[PDB]
Design a protein around this ligand. Sequence first.
Ligand SMILES: CC1=N[C@H](C(=O)O)CCN1
Length: 310
Amino acid sequence: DTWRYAFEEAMTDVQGVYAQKFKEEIEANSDHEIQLFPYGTLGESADIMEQTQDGILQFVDQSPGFTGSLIPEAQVFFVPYLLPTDQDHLARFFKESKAINDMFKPLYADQGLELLNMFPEGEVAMTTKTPVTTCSDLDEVKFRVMTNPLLVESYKAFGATPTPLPWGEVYGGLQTNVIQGQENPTFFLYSTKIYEVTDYITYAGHNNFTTAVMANKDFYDGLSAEDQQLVQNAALAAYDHTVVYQQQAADTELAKIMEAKPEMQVTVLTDEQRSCFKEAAAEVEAKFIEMTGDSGAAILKQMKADLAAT
Ligand SMILES: CC1=N[C@H](C(=O)O)CCN1
């Protein structure tokens, strides 16, 4: 059978680990067959989302970092320090969240997409060519960022000069010094060898990388009750498998960056040093309320209640 599936990373990366477990589970329990499409085929994240909405692709992985333009209240995932750093507590959140698994679903549906899961990918880290010790060290650093308004507002509040750019241009831009800064989890910034074109890694603990897996809603609604269930089963099985794997990654990948490039300067900021960043976190939150109205306000409240209950 057909059923095409496209994601934003390599096969060996985290979104690939998810895809491959999803593929296993579908194929072990039916006659259906999943066809995988990693980054490097079909093009950027914006491209594959269009391809999923046009109906060429059936399943797509698109991170809220790109969907913030489409669904405005997906900007919640970029309110600094909202998401906990405790990876065990974080995994229980996305699984049992009334906000993620109930309140977000009709909003994605408004754009013709059937939301399956959201999952974490790990604590994020700044890579720059100048030292970052406080917020004023970011002053006039051209910092690449995913394409959504609030994430852009975050690095303005940090003191940097934010630049929205699709991933395909990030390595080259850094190499030719058109940009001086970038942010991603540790597994990915090792995987993409981005340490070759940056000098400093900084753990501010401001965010965890979140991503989402969805299906073309028309396609999904066309399926039988058994097929729909089969998909839901495969998504839940892929989630459980991915969270275990991505925990191991964050806990081991930094050792490999230092192995391949021993000169690399890796700073993890103390709570004392993180103070100016957490001060910016409150005014970014205030900005989020202004942009998304009372619609996204109910999402923030529930998200906080889900974190507490878990
Ligand atoms: C951590 C990650 N970064 C990519 C990016 O910065 O656009 C998206 C695929 N996954």
